[PDB]
Amino acid sequence: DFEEIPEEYLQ
Amino acid sequence: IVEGSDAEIGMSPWQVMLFRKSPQELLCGASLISDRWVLTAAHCLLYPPWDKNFTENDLLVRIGKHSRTRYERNIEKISMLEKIYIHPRYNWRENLDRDIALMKLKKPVAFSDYIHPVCLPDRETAASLLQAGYKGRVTGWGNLKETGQPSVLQVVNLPIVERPVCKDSTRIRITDNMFCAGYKPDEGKRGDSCEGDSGGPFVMKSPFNNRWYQMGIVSWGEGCDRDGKYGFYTHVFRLKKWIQKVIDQF
Amino acid sequence: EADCGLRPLFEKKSLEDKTERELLESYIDGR
Ligand SMILES: N[C@@H](C(=O)N1CCC[C@H]1C(=O)NCc1cccc(Cl)c1)C(c1ccccc1)c1ccccc1
Ligand code: NA
Ligand code: NA
């Protein structure tokens, strides 16, 4: 339901 | 938030979203109190009855947001957590007494038109304003009704309730570390926090210095917006000695 | 912060939000 956040924050 | 309205842009620039990394989902609200410190409810992070025990690496905070679900490019900022601190006498077993936690960010966040810290109350501002009938304001992205979810941040203004009325509304043991707020059944206005608003701020605008202060943290309720029930909020001033000790030491 | 509680888009520009007056009107102390 949420727009994917940028991959950099999931490192 | 039940029976609230859409927030204005920049209305609550201390609002923080606690966000789970995997699955990606909203976990709670929170508030920005400095460039590296975020305040929330302890039960957002630790609640054994529901098998909840989040660690730093499970979570992000999202600051400057308005839309619940959108990635607000060039507006919101996403921060990783260095460390979680839960009040050492947080009572998750019984009644959520001392429902407060701090999160230190890995790096300071840059302030902007959309990102700005709220004040914490001094003793005198708290004494002047934490009085029955005086209204505060709650913001959050939680559910719109008990039994559904908002497009954008919601806001509701609610009156603080007399302590005997709070006590007489519930079977939970209430403590001096809590206050309750909401309209009474006869009053013709309504509103409450709800699931997903946990950890967000109950704020009041001082008429003495025209600054916003965080008096409460969204803590607990029985259902949402039920007649004769009230929302309960962590009493931030009563726990400020602990807040100050953590920030000074860490 | 020395600047806490003053919103860039409201207090810092002397603009009021649409319901803050509701809060003020409830505050008896000190007037
Ligand atoms: N409904 C429970 C509660 O509020 N909980 C459970 C843990 C997290 C918390 C919660 O859902 N908070 C969000 C919320 C919802 C509505 C209004 C507000 Cl202000 C906040 C509450 C409660 C349970 C049964 C009977 C009365 C009260 C509770 C109280 C103390 C201890 C255990 C359960
Ligand atoms: Na009771
Ligand atoms: Na109610």
Side-chain angles (χ1 to χ4, degrees), chain A residues 2-3 5-6 8-10, chain B residues 1-2 4-79 81-82 84-103 105-106 108-144 146 148-185 187-188 190-240 242-243 246-248 250, chain C residues 2-17 19-31:
Chain A
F2 286 80
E3 177 170 14
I5 68 165
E8 58 184 284
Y9 299 115
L10 299 168
Chain B
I1 306 287
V2 184
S5 62
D6 297 351
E8 293 168 68
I9 297 302
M11 191 188 208
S12 188
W14 36 81
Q15 185 69 40
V16 176
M17 185 186 290
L18 188 66
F19 199 70
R20 191 178 192 168
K21 286 185 189 178
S22 186
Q24 292 186 28
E25 59 179 0
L26 180 145
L27 288 178
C28 268
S31 62
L32 189 70
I33 65 169
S34 81
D35 68 356
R36 55 206 77 197
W37 288 95
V38 172
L39 185 61
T40 192
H43 83 261
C44 287
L45 302 167
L46 174 63
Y47 196 60
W50 294 351
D51 296 318
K52 183 188 293 179
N53 189 359
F54 288 115
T55 194
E56 290 79 359
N57 293 348
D58 297 334
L59 309 159
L60 298 166
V61 294
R62 301 173 68 171
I63 319 175
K65 287 193 61 52
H66 180 64
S67 173
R68 183 173 65 89
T69 59
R70 179 166 98 84
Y71 176 65
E72 291 176 292
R73 183 165 51 99
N74 296 7
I75 301 171
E76 73 170 283
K77 295 305 173 184
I78 300 185
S79 303
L81 302 186
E82 181 172 314
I84 292 165
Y85 304 87
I86 299 172
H87 197 290
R89 300 186 63 190
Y90 163 51
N91 190 344
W92 54 263
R93 290 176 172 278
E94 184 191 347
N95 55 359
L96 296 189
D97 201 9
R98 315 179 194 81
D99 187 15
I100 192 164
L102 285 158
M103 301 172 293
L105 307 181
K106 279 197 177 178
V109 69
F111 301 163
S112 74
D113 284 346
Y114 313 103
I115 299 179
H116 196 87
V118 70
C119 305
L120 296 187
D122 59 279
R123 184 177 296 275
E124 293 73 41
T125 300
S128 289
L129 298 179
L130 209 75
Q131 295 199 63
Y134 288 34
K135 291 177 178 178
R137 172 178 287 174
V138 184
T139 45
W141 296 276
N143 294 344
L144 296 168
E146 183 179 332
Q149 300 179 309
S151 172
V152 306
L153 185 67
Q154 298 293 291
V155 59
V156 70
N157 299 329
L158 299 171
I160 295 166
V161 170
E162 298 83 353
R163 298 191 73 82
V165 175
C166 299
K167 181 176 180 176
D168 283 351
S169 74
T170 186
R171 301 175 65 170
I172 303 293
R173 179 178 62 94
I174 79 163
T175 75
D176 284 358
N177 303 310
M178 309 171 186
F179 65 89
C180 96
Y183 293 99
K184 300 178 180 169
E187 282 188 293
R190 53 192 319 116
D192 198 0
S193 300
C194 200
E195 178 181 307
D197 294 317
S198 287
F202 179 108
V203 302
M204 303 182 81
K205 182 172 175 166
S206 171
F208 303 96
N209 68 2
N210 300 296
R211 293 183 186 244
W212 295 88
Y213 288 88
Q214 183 170 351
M215 306 324 293
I217 305 167
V218 176
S219 182
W220 63 268
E222 185 174 359
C224 312
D225 196 42
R226 294 188 188 172
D227 289 340
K229 304 298 194 179
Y230 300 90
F232 286 74
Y233 299 85
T234 310
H235 194 317
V236 172
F237 178 69
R238 252 215 137 219
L239 301 164
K240 191 176 174 189
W242 173 78
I243 293 169
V246 169
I247 292 169
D248 288 349
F250 297 115
Chain C
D3 206 32
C4 67
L6 298 169
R7 300 173 291 177
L9 299 178
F10 294 97
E11 288 74 25
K12 290 203 182 193
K13 302 176 173 200
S14 204
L15 295 174
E16 288 187 5
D17 75 51
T19 69
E20 58 171 275
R21 190 171 296 257
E22 182 184 357
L23 307 188
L24 175 57
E25 292 170 351
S26 77
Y27 303 156
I28 311 317
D29 188 62
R31 39 181 214 201

